[PDB]
Design an enzyme around this catalytic site. Structure first.
Site, PDB file in Angstrom:
ATOM      1  N   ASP A   1       1.156   5.110   1.870  1.00 45.52           N
ATOM      2  CA  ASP A   1       0.735   5.875   3.050  1.00 45.52           C
ATOM      3  C   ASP A   1       1.112   7.341   2.885  1.00 45.52           C
ATOM      4  O   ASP A   1       2.286   7.649   2.625  1.00 45.52           O
ATOM      5  CB  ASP A   1       1.459   5.299   4.265  1.00 45.52           C
TER       6      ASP A   1
ATOM      7  N   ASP B   1       0.849  -1.198   0.000  1.00 46.77           N
ATOM      8  CA  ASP B   1       0.000   0.000   0.000  1.00 46.77           C
ATOM      9  C   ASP B   1       0.882   1.246   0.000  1.00 46.77           C
ATOM     10  O   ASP B   1       2.108   1.146   0.031  1.00 46.77           O
ATOM     11  CB  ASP B   1      -0.988  -0.046   1.177  1.00 46.77           C
TER      12      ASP B   1
ATOM     13  N   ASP C   1      -3.692   4.850   1.851  1.00 49.43           N
ATOM     14  CA  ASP C   1      -4.239   5.454   3.070  1.00 49.43           C
ATOM     15  C   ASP C   1      -3.864   6.923   3.119  1.00 49.43           C
ATOM     16  O   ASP C   1      -2.689   7.292   2.976  1.00 49.43           O
ATOM     17  CB  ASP C   1      -3.703   4.763   4.307  1.00 49.43           C
TER      18      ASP C   1
HETATM   19  N1  LIG Z   1       1.006   4.942  15.037  1.00 46.84           N
HETATM   20  C1  LIG Z   1       0.217   4.241  14.225  1.00 46.84           C
HETATM   21  N2  LIG Z   1       0.847   3.657  13.206  1.00 46.84           N
HETATM   22  C2  LIG Z   1       0.150   2.929  12.339  1.00 46.84           C
HETATM   23  C3  LIG Z   1      -1.291   2.762  12.491  1.00 46.84           C
HETATM   24  N3  LIG Z   1      -1.661   1.980  11.454  1.00 46.84           N
HETATM   25  C4  LIG Z   1      -0.544   1.687  10.722  1.00 46.84           C
HETATM   26  N4  LIG Z   1       0.536   2.265  11.282  1.00 46.84           N
HETATM   27  C5  LIG Z   1       1.969   2.288  10.903  1.00 46.84           C
HETATM   28  C6  LIG Z   1       2.629   0.916  10.872  1.00 46.84           C
HETATM   29  C7  LIG Z   1       3.276   0.825   9.504  1.00 46.84           C
HETATM   30  O1  LIG Z   1       4.690   0.643   9.597  1.00 46.84           O
HETATM   31  C8  LIG Z   1       2.976   2.138   8.804  1.00 46.84           C
HETATM   32  C9  LIG Z   1       2.237   1.920   7.516  1.00 46.84           C
HETATM   33  O2  LIG Z   1       1.563   0.685   7.690  1.00 46.84           O
HETATM   34  P1  LIG Z   1       1.761  -0.383   6.522  1.00 46.84           P
HETATM   35  O3  LIG Z   1       0.864  -1.561   6.817  1.00 46.84           O
HETATM   36  O4  LIG Z   1       1.629   0.404   5.242  1.00 46.84           O
HETATM   37  O5  LIG Z   1       3.300  -0.840   6.692  1.00 46.84           O
HETATM   38  P2  LIG Z   1       4.510  -0.418   5.696  1.00 46.84           P
HETATM   39  O6  LIG Z   1       4.061   0.627   4.719  1.00 46.84           O
HETATM   40  O7  LIG Z   1       5.683  -0.121   6.602  1.00 46.84           O
HETATM   41  O8  LIG Z   1       4.832  -1.781   4.881  1.00 46.84           O
HETATM   42  P3  LIG Z   1       4.174  -2.171   3.455  1.00 46.84           P
HETATM   43  O9  LIG Z   1       5.342  -2.262   2.509  1.00 46.84           O
HETATM   44  O10 LIG Z   1       3.228  -1.040   3.154  1.00 46.84           O
HETATM   45  O11 LIG Z   1       3.496  -3.496   3.735  1.00 46.84           O
HETATM   46  O12 LIG Z   1       2.112   2.905   9.628  1.00 46.84           O
HETATM   47  C10 LIG Z   1      -1.914   3.445  13.656  1.00 46.84           C
HETATM   48  O13 LIG Z   1      -3.143   3.372  13.882  1.00 46.84           O
HETATM   49  N5  LIG Z   1      -1.106   4.151  14.462  1.00 46.84           N
HETATM   50 MG   LIG Z   2       2.604   1.030   3.663  1.00 49.69          MG
END
Ligand SMILES: Nc1nc2c(ncn2[C@H]2C[C@H](O)[C@@H](COP(=O)(O)OP(=O)(O)OP(=O)(O)O)O2)c(=O)[nH]1
Ligand SMILES: [Mg+2]
Length: 331
Positions: free
Chosen positions: A196, A194, A255
């Site tokens: 962000d 995704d 998101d």
């Molecule tokens: N503080 C906080 N952080 C959140 C929340 N929901 C998600 N995150 C954080 C954790 C993740 O590392 C980051 C974006 O979530 P993702 O699922 O997109 O993880 P990320 O983009 O690091 O990996 P990906 O390559 O997208 O699977 O934001 C929340 O409600 N509060």
């Molecule tokens: Mg992400």
């Protein structure tokens, strides 16, 4: 010696122990599928240690003096070094429970509890879910409709194109408003699940009502397949975008999060991850410094005070940690 907490050490994007960390992360994920949260965290921490090592682990003698490397994680690595394969990991990979839980939890809007419920009820395939639409939320229906595109890795090129349309929409709705790429892509990842974005404006309150305006603009360009707006704790929109490509298009999860500028540094820190890095940073904060950290602030529960931060650097400094840029938060 390597520090105990992931937030006290750099963890780069690329490392020398990908086979070993992948195997431990399968066991972590499988533990989470069974609601075994202690075991999940244990395997995740061990995998994270390997990601921070400067050299490949070629012999088991190289595990000496490393934190978060208990007997179980050590045995897994030993079997991989000696035999090229770990029987426990292979059994998990091949198991219907793991495969189905992975299949279901991957779908947009499905967590472990929902996936486990469906498993218990005898559902196994995506077609099985489509045969029971009354079991699905609208978000999950959208995830199923687009499941092929949503399990195609999102690429940096996709992110750049998406950032342009979001920035255009934000700039047209409110000059001065800003868009910041967060998540894994801010940490330097080449791919992801995704995209962000964190939106704010330098004058507190000028961000009010911005997101619905942004969404209207994007919808009127044909760029939105699915949108769920929620006022509540940050205002956010959970989206599937229709990304035009040469000769075709693809669905991509995006998101959009709005933070008031006072909370922005906390939101950026939180949303940049990695998930394990932030868990570790919050545990460090509570256990070592007596402060409660989240995406909104840093609270002293004894004094009943909130820390004023202008940047992520301020937050690291206030917690007595050396600053780590996002590309070293790949725990
Ligand atoms: N503080 C906080 N952080 C959140 C929340 N929901 C998600 N995150 C954080 C954790 C993740 O590392 C980051 C974006 O979530 P993702 O699922 O997109 O993880 P990320 O983009 O690091 O990996 P990906 O390559 O997208 O699977 O934001 C929340 O409600 N509060
Ligand atoms: Mg992400």
């Amino acid at each position: 010696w390597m520090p105990a907490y992931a937030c006290q050490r750099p963890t780069p994007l690329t490392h020398h122990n990908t086979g070993l960390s992948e195997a431990l992360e399968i066991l972590a994920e499988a533990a989470g599928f069974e609601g075994s949260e202690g075991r999940l965290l244990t395997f995740c921490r061990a995998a994270s240690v390997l990601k921070a090592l400067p050299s490949p682990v070629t012999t088991l003698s190289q595990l000496q003096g490393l934190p978060h490397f208990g007997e179980h994680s050590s045995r897994v690595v030993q079997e991989l070094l000696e035999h090229g394969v770990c029987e426990e990991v292979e059994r998990v990979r091949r198991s219907e429970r793991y495969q189905t839980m992975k299949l279901f939890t991957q779908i947009f809007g499905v967590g472990v509890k929902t996936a486990d419920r469906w498993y218990r009820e005898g559902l196994r395939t995506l077609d099985d879910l489509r045969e029971q639409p009354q079991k699905l939320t609208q978000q999950q229906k959208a995830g199923l409709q687009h499941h092929q595109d949503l399990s195609t890795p999102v690429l940096r090129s996709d992110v750049d194109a998406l950032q342009q349309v979001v920035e255009e929409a934000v700039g047209q709705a409110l000059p001065g408003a800003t868009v910041t790429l967060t998540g894994g892509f801010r940490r330097g990842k080449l791919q992801g699940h995704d995209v962000d974005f964190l939106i704010t404006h330098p004058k507190e309150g000028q961000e009010a009502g911005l997101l619905p305006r942004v969404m209207c603009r994007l919808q009127d360009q044909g760029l939105i397949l699915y949108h769920q707006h929620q006022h509540s704790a940050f205002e956010r929109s959970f989206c599937i975008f229709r990304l035009p490509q040469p000769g075709s298009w693809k669905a991509v999860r995006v998101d959009l999060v709005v933070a008031p500028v006072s909370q922005f540094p906390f939101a950026l820190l939180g949303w940049t991850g990695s998930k394990l890095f932030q868990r570790e940073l919050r545990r460090f904060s509570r256990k070592e410094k007596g402060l409660w950290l989240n995406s909104h602030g840093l609270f002293d529960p004894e004094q009943k005070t909130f820390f004023q931060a202008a940047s992520e650097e301020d937050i690291f400094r206030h917690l007595g940690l050396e600053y780590l840029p996002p590309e070293q938060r790949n725990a």
